[PDB]
Design a protein around this ligand. Structure first.
Ligand code: NAG
Ligand code: NAG
Ligand code: NAG
Ligand code: NAG
Ligand code: NAG
Ligand code: NAG
Ligand code: NAG
Ligand code: NAG
Ligand code: NAG
Ligand code: NAG
Ligand code: NAG
Ligand code: NAG
Ligand code: NAG
Lengths: 368, 204, 414, 99, 49
């Protein structure tokens, strides 16, 4: 706010305006990034008063009405992340609005599965949604219903480990905390550069105007103008490149929102390790957290196997699953869970005589 | 004779309050763990400036002289405690080559269980004094701990200095270097710890 | 807005046109209590005085020289100054000042000037052509003149050569005034080099005695031990002001504060070097400094082809510092706050948006996220679609920029 | 005097080329997305939820536009639901049947 | 390696320090990029004899 300096800054023309235009382009994009992750749901779906989700317990991830109206795990995440012409603008969506979108996405997912992404939300019982998520990974739905208490207890236990993982240490949130740190470090660096001389007699602008007369002071001030303007161009270039890194992360987060919250991804290791069942979005400062629920197969046995079995000269192949021998009998099992079925013309289909197939075995096929 | 200085000899480098914060600054400081000179007086070089410290609960030491000749041909600082307070003069003193006290002039001014520590430095035309007083439990070496020295006076005398001597049981002398230091300011703006950045790779 | 966009038509949006900044209500100056006023009484008011052949110099240093005490003293028979106007003296600073003092007759006071000639000028006290400093005199016939004549005062009548500028020579050696060799004793044309004015009370205005003082100034590598007195104003808290404390010039709002500076500390700094507190030099309170209130000014507008009404957002400002409404984004002016919620038309921030709506005005509202829906969940109900719609969705993606190439030589140096 | 013009005009041109390099990377990310939407949505049938527009993807058609591409994503949207009572399995002669 | 030039360069403040910081950030990211591709396998599997 020196008027002597302002008259010299006008000689540099459009440099000052295009720094404000560049930072405004970044600032508006941060709301576009936040909108396109969370605002994927057209209606604010809300959970019923009852909580009979087949024994699954979402109480740590659904909203807490006693709390902003964040979930328990969203409150952990919001606790663990922590004027020389510079200003900071508010986001377009408050944390209370972001928590209404994660609540709507979660309440839709729980009460209606993949269906609320594709059209109107269609209700389905949670144990039947999980059966259709099990069929999606090639495990036959009776493997859910016959194990529903075990699967519910394993899910409830695994959400319990998320509370401990986020309560006992902050160190998991390093990706979000580093985004706060890089912006604080960049703003402090931009302000610290006001103390630098850039070769001028002093860095204090009124000090130059006391020590020297107009023509000499103008030569000393033009060093401060050159250095401070080069320090803004350095900061705004650095924020343009850092905004491209955050936009690439926001496009990835918008894609995990669409393909894993609103659906069930078939893409290997995209939405957690193991075969993907579903995921739940939880908000965090400057980011999003997905709790990816996945099936991991856990207790293998070795079996002898054959590509086909030869019956009355005909080679039989399994429709779904694979042949295995327990040691002396032969069975067909689904691929991803040991459930042995007796080999029948329902389980198997024919293709030609034995002699074409390398490694075919002689065993009986039952005809009902 | 010589001694390890430990972490002694930090002072407030400017009249600025800072709090709850770490400040990185370059100034004439005594290096940490420097191997400083020790005495029970000789004329000494002044270099960039001096840290001077004494086991003073005794009034053996009375004052100092600073200049180039320390004799007649040019003006020199004389500093003496008159047993009430410090007196300062800058006269062309022709005084004794072995000065002692019982166990023209262009400027003038008037202000064992203990250590009294002082820093003397000259910049562009001002002579600056910083000091501190503390209890101690050791007779031989400097007390191994930390406490910063506070400014007393900042004198507009314009004199050139290259040598000094004491007027007058242990006391110690060490020379400032243009070190970079990191300074820990507490809630009341006292320096409560420091790192000599050039000391070792962890300090860097 | 039209000027900030450099165009005559403005389309719908929010445009940052300008920056609001509270102006300083007044300018304030603070310095320590004015002390060590220079010892001019020892030269201007002392009872004793010097003979002009052997003048007395007082060295002036380490003090504030209020020259207005001298030049406003209407009792003085003359004031003159060289290289400086009297009203400018109290702004200046010097390494040393010298006050040179003597008694002379009134008719020789006119000799006391740069480069002039006469008995005093050439043989008692010589001033250079480039003398910078002041000449001051007053009649002293009350002290320096006596019945029968005061013969105690003397001036040099004879010398072999003129004095150089500020040369001092008190010697009484007998002077050869002609062909007579002196041989260490007086005689015809071998004379005592001094004479007396003999000041009698019957003397006229030009023969009466005057006490004279000449002030000489210098600036060197040693710092300025003399300055004219520093002014100061009253202190204003809670208003926006421009301020100086000693040499710490700035603009801000001043308040009392909970900060406890150590006794020697004068200023306080924030994490990023920015000054945020000061000690007042006349009563040692610690004042917080905060910047005078500022923020981006944004014009919210419908398209100018539809309406010329506008609303203004003062980003981060609180309205008491500028319909009117305090949003979390800042003071919003010229927009009706509305109790409904709608899809976001023009965004403002912190959940607020604005639009031009019904007879029409700019409204501002908390944006609506979407229609609330209770999914009809129960543990044995399923909804199955009985029918479908084929939907066609248009998606647009950019694929390439306009290819440009610049001749760097022709752009820089046509 | 000319060194002031050369310094200002060269820094003016470096500021433009720096922004064009960053803007070209933004458009490359969109050209790689459009290349992927053509391979997966047009040349195939993507099962990736909301990748090829809202609803279940049937097919899409490219149309050119100046500096871009436009996809007409044809999707099946379910539209007139009815509530039914449901069960995970049914118990017949003491055995559980699943659909 | 001029002493006289280095004491001029310090008067530009954080420009030289933030160039070293920027290139160090690029250097560490090359190790991250190379881990994200190849280090997806949890164990060093070996083929049979
Ligand atoms: C769900 O789990 C929480 C503890 O994690 C427990 O307090 C609650 O009673 C459980 N049941 C329901 C229906 O919330
Ligand atoms: C399968 O058999 C091999 C025989 O070498 C053995 O090493 C392996 O541990 C067995 N795996 C299991 C799960 O029993
Ligand atoms: C294999 O399955 C049959 C099923 O009746 C069982 O009797 C037999 O004990 C199993 N084990 C072996 C080693 O054959
Ligand atoms: C496996 O290899 C052995 C090698 O001796 C061979 O006897 C056997 O027929 C092969 N079986 C299949 C299924 O390829
Ligand atoms: C399988 O059965 C056929 C007909 O009985 C016989 O010729 C053949 O040798 C048997 N064994 C194998 C391994 O093909
Ligand atoms: C300390 O320094 C002196 C020379 O300044 C040297 O004679 C002495 O040996 C040194 N002592 C140690 C322990 O390094
Ligand atoms: C600061 O000074 C106050 C004086 O009342 C004292 O209470 C406090 O303990 C001191 N120390 C700190 C670190 O604030
Ligand atoms: C300054 O002078 C005034 C008036 O004599 C007095 O009230 C005040 O205490 C003085 N302050 C200092 C710091 O000397
Ligand atoms: C302005 O509004 C009129 C309404 O009839 C319309 O014809 C015209 O296209 C509009 N032009 C612009 C620049 O909005
Ligand atoms: C705005 O300023 C007034 C004082 O002018 C203050 O009382 C108020 O708390 C401030 N904040 C808001 C949101 O009004
Ligand atoms: C909105 O309605 C509430 C309750 O009637 C009232 O307190 C508030 O002032 C209203 N605001 C506006 C702008 O109508
Ligand atoms: C299905 O919807 C279409 C309109 O989209 C309607 O014409 C048709 O009659 C409906 N058919 C049934 C079976 O409801
Ligand atoms: C389904 O049941 C709910 C609750 O009884 C009801 O609100 C809704 O209108 C019903 N019909 C459809 C098609 O959802």
């Amino acid at each position: 706010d020196s008027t002597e300096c302002s008259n010299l800054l006008l000689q540099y023309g459009s440099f000052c305006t295009q720094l404000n235009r560049a930072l405004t382009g970044i600032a508006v994009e941060q709301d576009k990034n936040t909108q396109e992750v969370f605002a994927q749901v057209k209606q604010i779906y809300k959970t019923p008063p009852i909580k009979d989700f087949g024994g699954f317990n979402f109480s740590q991830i659904l909203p807490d009405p006693s709390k902003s109206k964040r979930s328990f795990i969203e409150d952990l995440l919001f606790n663990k992340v922590t004027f020389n012409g510079l200003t900071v603008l508010p986001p377009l969506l408050t944390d209370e609005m972001i928590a209404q979108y994660t609540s709507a996405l979660l309440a839709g997912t729980i009460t209606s599965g993949w269906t609320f992404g594709a059209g109107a939300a269609l209700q389905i019982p949670f144990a039947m949604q999980m059966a259709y998520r099990f069929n999606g990974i090639g495990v036959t739905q009776n493997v859910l219903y016959e194990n529903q208490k075990l699967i519910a207890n394993q899910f409830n236990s695994a959400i319990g480990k998320i509370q401990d993982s986020l309560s006992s240490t902050a160190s998991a949130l390093g990706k979000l905390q580093d985004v706060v740190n890089q912006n604080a470090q960049a703003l402090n660096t931009l302000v610290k550069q006001l103390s630098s001389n850039f070769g001028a007699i002093s860095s204090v602008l009124n000090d130059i105007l006391s020590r020297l007369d107009k023509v000499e002071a103008e030569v000393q001030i033009d060093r401060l103008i050159t250095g401070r303007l080069q320090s803004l161009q350095t900061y705004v270039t650095q924020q343009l490149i850092r905004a491209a890194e955050i936009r690439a992360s926001a496009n990835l987060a918008a894609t995990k929102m669409s393909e894993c919250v609103l659906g069930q991804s078939k893409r290997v290791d995209f939405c957690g390790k193991g075969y993907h069942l579903m995921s739940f979005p939880q908000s965090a400062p400057h980011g999003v957290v997905f709790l990816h629920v996945t099936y991991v197969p856990a207790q293998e046995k070795n079996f002898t196997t054959a590509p086909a079995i030869c019956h009355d000269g005909k080679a039989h192949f399994p429709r779904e699953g694979v042949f295995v021998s327990n040691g002396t009998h032969w069975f067909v099992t689904q691929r991803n869970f040991y459930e042995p079925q007796i080999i029948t013309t329902d389980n198997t289909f024919v293709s030609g005589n034995c002699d074409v197939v390398i490694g075919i075995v002689n065993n009986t096929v039952y005809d009902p | 004779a010589y001694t390890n200085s430990f972490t002694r000899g930090v002072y407030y480098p400017d009249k600025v309050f800072r709090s709850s914060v770490l400040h990185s600054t370059q100034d004439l400081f005594l290096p940490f763990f420097s191997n400083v000179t020790w005495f029970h007086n000789p004329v000494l070089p002044f270099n960039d400036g001096v840290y001077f410290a004494s086991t003073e609960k005794s009034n053996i030491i009375r004052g100092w002289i600073f200049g180039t000749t320390l004799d007649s041909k040019t003006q020199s600082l004389l500093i003496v405690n008159n047993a009430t307070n410090v007196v300062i003069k800058v006269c062309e003193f022709q005084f004794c080559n072995d000065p002692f006290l019982g166990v023209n002039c262009t400027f003038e001014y008037v202000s064992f269980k203990n250590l009294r520590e002082f820093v003397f430095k000259n910049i562009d035309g001002y002579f600056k004094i910083y000091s501190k007083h503390t209890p101690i439990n050791l007779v031989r070496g400097l007390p191994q701990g930390f406490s910063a020295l506070e400014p007393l006076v900042d004198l507009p005398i314009g004199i050139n200095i290259t040598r000094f001597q004491t007027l007058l049981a242990a006391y110690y002398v060490g020379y400032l270097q243009p070190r970079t230091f990191l300074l820990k300011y507490n809630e009341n703006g006292t320096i409560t710890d420091a790192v000599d950045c050039a000391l070792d790779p962890l300090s860097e | 807005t039209k000027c900030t966009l450099k165009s005559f038509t403005v389309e719908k949006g929010i445009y940052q046109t300008s920056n609001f900044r509270v102006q300083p209500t007044e300018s304030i100056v603070r310095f320590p209590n004015i002390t060590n006023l220079c010892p001019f009484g020892e030269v201007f008011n002392a009872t004793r005085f010097a003979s002009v052949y052997a003048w007395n110099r007082k060295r002036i240093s380490n003090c504030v020289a209020d020259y207005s005490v001298l030049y406003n003293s209407a009792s003085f028979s003359t004031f003159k100054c060289y290289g400086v106007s009297p009203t400018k003296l109290n702004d200046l600073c010097f390494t040393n000042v010298y006050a040179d003092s003597f008694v002379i007759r009134g008719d020789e006071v006119r000799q006391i000037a740069p480069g002039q000639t006469g008995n005093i000028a050439d043989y008692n006290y010589k001033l250079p052509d480039d003398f910078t400093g002041c000449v001051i005199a007053w009649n002293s016939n009350n002290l320096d003149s006596k019945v029968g004549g005061n013969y105690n005062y003397l001036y040099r009548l004879f010398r072999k050569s003129n004095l150089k500028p500020f040369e001092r020579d008190i010697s009484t050696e007998i002077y050869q005034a002609g062909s007579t060799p002196c041989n260490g004793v007086k005689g015809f044309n071998c004379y005592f080099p001094l004479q007396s004015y003999g000041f009698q009370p019957t003397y006229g205005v030009g023969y009466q005695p005057y006490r004279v003082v000449v002030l000489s100034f210098e600036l060197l590598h040693a710092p300025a031990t003399v300055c004219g007195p520093k002014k100061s104003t009253n202190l204003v808290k809670n208003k926006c002001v421009n301020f100086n404390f000693n040499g710490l010039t700035g603009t801000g709002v001043l308040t009392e504060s909970n900060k406890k500076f150590l006794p020697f500390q004068q200023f306080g700094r924030d994490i990023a070097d920015t000054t945020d507190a000061v000690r007042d030099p006349q009563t040692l309170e610690i004042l917080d400094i905060t910047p005078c209130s500022f923020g981006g000014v944004s014009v919210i507008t419908p398209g100018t082809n539809t309406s010329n009404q506008v609303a203004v957002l003062y980003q981060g400002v609180n309205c008491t510092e500028v319909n009117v409404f305090q949003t979390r984004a800042g003071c919003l002016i010229g927009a009706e706050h509305v109790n409904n919620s709608y899809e976001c038309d023009i965004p403002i921030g912190a959940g607020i948006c604005a639009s031009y709506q019904t007879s029409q005005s700019i409204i501002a509202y908390t944006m609506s996220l979407g229609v609330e829906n209770s999914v009809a969940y129960s543990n044995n109900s399923i909804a199955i679609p009985t029918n479908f719609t084929i939907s066609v969705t248009t998606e647009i993606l950019p694929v390439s920029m306009t290819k440009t190439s610049v001749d760097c030589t022709m752009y820089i140096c046509g």
